[PDB]
Structures are given as C-alpha cells and as structure tokens.
C-alpha cells in the first residue's frame, strides 16, 4: 500500500535526522521506533490480506478441479 510507502519515507526522514543529530537525539530514536512499529503494523495488515486472498484462490481452484472431476 501507499501508506506503507509513506510510513517508510517518514522513517527514512527520521533516520537521516537521527544520523545528522549523531553528527534531542533520544527523543528522535524513540519517535523513529514508533515510525518503525507503525510500518510493521501496516505491513502486517497487508500480509493478512494476502493470506486471505490466497485461501480464496485456493477455494476457487479447488472448485474448478472438482468441477472437472465431476464432469468425468
């Protein structure tokens, strides 16, 4: 999803800030960990959708396989 891409871009922005600050940092590290957690949660949501999409495709292919067996 574009949100995962948006959360990643925000993590990239915060990462550059934390590295530059390395060269207030602790707050940035904590915020960055929240940025990463949000990304992981968004990826989890899409991953869960693909899991259900795979099971629906499994059901559709099984119905076709059974139709072809039944036609014999």
């Amino acid at each position: 999803t574009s949100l995962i891409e948006e959360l990643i871009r925000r993590s990239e922005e915060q990462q550059r800030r934390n590295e530059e600050a390395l060269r207030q940092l602790l707050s940035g590290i904590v915020q960055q960990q929240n940025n990463l957690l949000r990304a992981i949660e968004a990826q989890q949501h899409l991953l869960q959708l693909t899991v259900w999409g795979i099971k629906q495709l499994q059901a559709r292919i099984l119905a076709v396989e059974r139709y072809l067996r039944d036609q014999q």
Copy 2:
C-alpha cells in the same frame, strides 16, 4: 499469525513505556529494538509461507490450464 499480533502488542507496550520514561530509557530502547526485530522475523516467516503458497497455486492453475488444452 497471532504471534505477530502478540509481538506487536508487546512492542506497543514497550513503546508506551519508553515514551513515558522520556517524560533505564536506554535499556528500554534496546529491548524495543529486539521486540521490533522479532516482529520482522515473524513477518518474514509468514511472508515466506505465502510465497510458497502462491507457487503451489500457480502449479495447480497450470495443471488445470494444461488439462483443458489437452482435452482439445
């Protein structure tokens, strides 16, 4: 999986603790990075299973497509 949801909830708990501590913190940030890494590893395991599930569906649909071609 429910484990990924459990690892995420633990990361959410540790995140609230680190933010509240921001308002011992370093240990919490290190632990939180382990919580995130465990989540990423669990997501990787489920992602790998979906990759193999997709290839098995590909093989099943290909077998049906070939059966239908062969019947002609």
Copy 3:
C-alpha cells in the same frame, strides 16, 4: 528472499552488540534502526511482489472459470 535473511542476520549481530555494550551505544542503536528499516523496506518489496502474484493468479483462475462457463 535471502537478502531479507541477510538484513535480519545483520540486525541480529547488531542487537547482540548493543546488548553487550549495554553490559558508542547510541551510534549502535541508530545503526540498528537503519538495519531494521532496511529489513522493513526489503519485506515491503517482497510483499508487493506477492500482491501482484495474487492478482495474476486471480486473472488466470477467472479466465478458466469463464472458459468453463463458455463451454456450456
């Protein structure tokens, strides 16, 4: 992918270093957050490929379902 496994192993290495340093640490935490972000980005790439793989399987099964309907 093996890259995600390589990024994870690097995060595991950096995590052990940060925990041992807990027992220079800030640089290690920042680097570890970059290791995690890279993992999340790599997982996002594979996740996006599975999403497109699922839609192509959907199109293939739909074509078979339509062929079978049309043959009647």
